[PDB]
Amino acid sequence: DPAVTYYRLEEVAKRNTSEETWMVIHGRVYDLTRFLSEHPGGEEVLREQAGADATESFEDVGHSPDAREMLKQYYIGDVHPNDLKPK
């Protein structure tokens, strides 16, 4: 619990603009505000899903091992349990 700060998806949803962009990937929240400019796939696809769980798009694109490593530096917390899928 403790080493983990939780975020309700309703809060994540509000970080959907260039000033502060967050995104959920496999139950974890990422502050990608500084990452936007450096994303090889470009900014637009990230703006389209900012504030939301983009796990499915992330996985369908087929990101590389180094892409997944890059996620870590932007990890800020976990999705609140109330917002998680039931199974």
The one among 6, 11, 43, 57 contacting ligand HEM by CB under 6 A: 57
> Choosing among Mg ion, ligand HEM, none, which partner's interface includes residue 71 (Cβ < 5 to 8 Å by kind)?
ligand HEM
Give exposure, 37-69, as e/b (b: 16+ Cβ within 10 Å): eeeeeeeeebeebbbbbbeebbeeeebeeeeee
Could you say whether residue 54 binds ligand HEM (CB under 6 A)?
yes
Task: Record the tokens describing residue 22, joined without a space.
Answer: 């967050």
Q: With binding defined as CB under 6 A, does residue 63 bind ligand HEM?
A: yes
Does 26 appear as a known binding residue? no
Which SS3 state, helix, strand or coil, does residue 76 take?
A: strand
- 63 labeled binding residue: yes
39 near ligand HEM, judged by CB under 6 A = yes
In the three-class reduction of DSSP (H, G, I as helix; E, B as strand; rest coil), residue 57 is classed as helix
The yes or no reply on residue 33 touching ligand HEM (CB under 6 A) is no
Annotated binding site for heme: 39, 63
